[PDB]
Design a protein around this ligand. Structure first.
Ligand SMILES: OC[C@H]1O[C@@H](O[C@H]2[C@H](O)[C@@H](O)[C@H](O)O[C@@H]2CO)[C@H](O)[C@@H](O)[C@H]1O
Length: 138
C-alpha cells in the first residue's frame, strides 16, 4: 500500500515506448481521480476522471502552462466504478499518450508539451487507495 498524493519520479523524463502501470481501488463515494504529468510547475498531461459533474461521470484531460489550463478534452466513456479495483496503463507514443483502463483502450492525448524529456514527475491523487505505481520499457 502507498500514500496518496503520490509522486512517482520518471528519471530522465518520458520517452516513447515507456509504459506506466497504476493499480488501485476507487474509494466508495469517490468524487475525483487525477494523474498529473509534470514538467516543473507545468502539467503536461492532466487526466481527471470526475465521478459527479452535474450528475454525469466524465473524464477531463488538459494541460496547464504557466498556471493556465488550456482547452479541455472530454471523454464520456467512463470505466471507473466506486469501490472497485482498476488498472490504468499510460503508454507513451511519439505523438500521444495512450490510456487503457482494465486492459481496454480509453483515449489518446496529443502531446502539447513537446519536450518529453522534461516531463519527469508523475503525481497521483484523488479518491483512491493506491496499490502499485511503476513503469517499464516495452
Ligand atoms: O481543465 C482541468 C481543470 O479544470 C478545473 O475545473 C474547470 C472546469 O472543468 C471548467 O468547466 C470551468 O469552466 O473551469 C474550471 C477551472 O478551469 C479544475 O478545478 C482543475 O482541477 C482542473 O481539473
Amino acid at each position: 500500500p502507498l500514500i496518496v498524493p503520490y509522486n512517482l519520479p520518471l528519471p530522465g523524463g518520458v520517452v516513447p515506448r515507456m509504459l506506466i502501470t497504476i493499480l488501485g481501488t476507487v474509494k466508495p463515494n469517490a468524487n475525483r481521480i487525477a494523474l498529473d504529468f509534470q514538467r516543473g510547475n507545468d502539467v503536461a498531461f492532466h487526466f481527471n476522471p470526475r465521478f459527479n459533474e452535474n450528475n454525469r461521470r466524465v473524464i477531463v484531460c488538459n494541460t496547464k502552462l504557466d498556471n493556465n489550463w488550456g482547452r479541455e478534452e472530454r471523454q464520456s466513456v467512463f470505466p471507473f466504478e466506486s469501490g472497485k479495483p482498476f488498472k490504468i496503463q499510460v503508454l507513451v507514443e511519439p505523438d500521444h499518450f495512450k490510456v487503457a483502463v482494465n486492459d481496454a483502450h480509453l483515449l489518446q492525448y496529443n502531446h502539447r508539451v513537446k519536450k518529453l524529456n522534461e516531463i519527469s514527475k508523475l503525481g497521483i491523487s484523488g479518491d483512491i487507495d493506491l496499490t502499485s505505481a511503476s513503469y517499464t520499457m516495452i
